[PDB]
Design a protein around this ligand. Structure first.
Ligand code: ZN
Length: 282
C-alpha cells in the first residue's frame, strides 16, 4: 500500500527513483527565499509604518488605498528591495526537477521572481500571489504592460510609476489585499493534482488558504515531503501515518540532503556557484 519504504528522507529519495515517480509538484512559500535576503509574516513589516501616516497599517498593501496613495507602497518597496536577486539552493533544486522532466508545477506564494530567475518558465509556474515580474497600467481601457526592469528603475529612482500612454498609475502584478488570486491558480488546480506522483512542500507552514488546501487534492497514495522549520499540515506521527515525511530545518540544507540521496548534489551545487557568478557579473 505505502508507496514509501519508510517515512524518511531516504524513502522519499528511493521512491523518486522508482518508475512510478513521474510527476512532481512543488508547493513553496516565503521560507525558500529567506536565505536570499527576501523577507516574510510577523517579521515586523507593519510595525515600522508610522512615517507613512496610514489609516491602518495594512492599508499599504490594500488595492483601494494604493490606487489613491501609491507612494507609501513604492517607498516601502525601495526600502525592502534586495540589492541582488540570486535564487537559493532550493530554487535551483527545483530547476533540476524541470531539467530532468520531473516538474509538473511549482506553486509559489512568493512574489520575488526567483523561480523565474532560476530558470522555471511560465508553464512551470503558478504564482499564487502574483509577481513583480510584470506590471500593468491600472486603467481598464489601457492595461499597458511594463517589465521588471522598468518597474525596478521607477522604484529605485522614487518616481511614482505612471503609464507612458495614459499617465494612469502602474501597479506590479502582485495580489494586493482586496484583490482575488489569479485565474491561473484556480484553473491549474482543477487538474494538476489528479495524477501527481509526489508533493514537495518547502518553506511554508500551510497556514494560508486556499493555497494550503492544494496538498489534499493529490491522490491519497501520493507521498508528501515537507521541508520547513516546523511540522504542520500533514500526518507525520500518528498511528495512521503512511506517506508524509517532515525534514525540519532551513530549506537550503534540506534540499542539499535530498540532492545527495539522489546523486544530484554535484550537479546542483555546480549550478548554484555558476548562476550566482553570472548574476554578480551583471
Ligand atoms: Zn495606461
Amino acid at each position: 500500500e505505502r508507496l514509501l519504504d519508510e517515512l524518511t528522507l531516504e524513502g522519499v529519495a528511493r521512491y523518486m527513483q522508482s518508475e512510478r515517480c513521474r510527476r512532481v509538484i512543488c508547493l513553496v512559500g516565503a521560507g525558500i527565499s529567506t536565505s536570499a535576503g527576501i523577507p516574510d509574516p510577523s517579521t515586523g513589516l507593519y510595525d515600522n509604518l508610522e512615517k507613512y501616516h496610514l489609516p491602518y497599517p495594512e492599508a499599504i498593501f490594500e488595492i483601494s488605498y494604493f490606487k489613491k496613495h501609491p507612494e507609501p507602497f513604492f517607498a516601502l518597496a525601495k526600502e525592502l528591495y534586495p540589492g541582488q536577486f540570486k535564487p537559493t539552493i532550493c530554487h535551483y533544486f527545483m530547476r533540476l526537477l524541470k531539467d530532468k522532466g520531473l516538474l509538473l508545477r511549482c506553486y509559489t506564494q512568493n512574489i520575488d521572481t526567483l523561480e523565474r530567475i532560476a530558470g522555471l518558465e511560465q508553464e512551470d509556474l503558478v504564482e499564487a500571489h502574483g509577481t513583480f515580474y510584470t506590471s500593468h497600467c491600472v486603467s481598464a481601457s489601457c492595461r499597458h504592460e511594463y517589465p521588471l526592469s522598468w518597474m525596478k528603475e521607477k522604484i529605485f529612482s522614487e518616481v511614482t510609476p505612471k503609464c507612458e500612454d495614459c499617465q494612469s498609475l502602474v501597479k506590479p502584478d502582485i495580489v494586493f489585499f482586496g484583490e482575488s488570486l489569479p485565474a491561473r491558480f484556480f484553473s491549474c488546480m482543477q487538474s494538476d493534482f489528479l495524477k501527481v506522483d509526489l508533493l514537495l512542500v518547502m518553506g511554508t507552514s500551510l497556514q494560508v488558504q486556499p493555497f494550503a488546501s492544494l496538498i489534499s487534492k493529490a491522490p491519497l497514495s501520493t507521498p508528501r515531503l515537507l521541508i520547513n522549520k516546523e511540522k504542520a499540515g500533514m500526518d507525520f506521527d500518528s498511528k495512521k501515518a503512511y506517506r508524509d515525511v517532515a525534514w525540519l530545518g532551513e530549506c537550503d540544507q534540506g534540499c542539499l540532503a535530498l540532492a545527495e540521496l539522489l546523486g544530484w548534489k554535484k550537479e546542483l551545487e555546480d549550478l548554484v556557484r555558476r548562476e550566482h557568478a553570472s548574476i554578480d557579473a551583471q
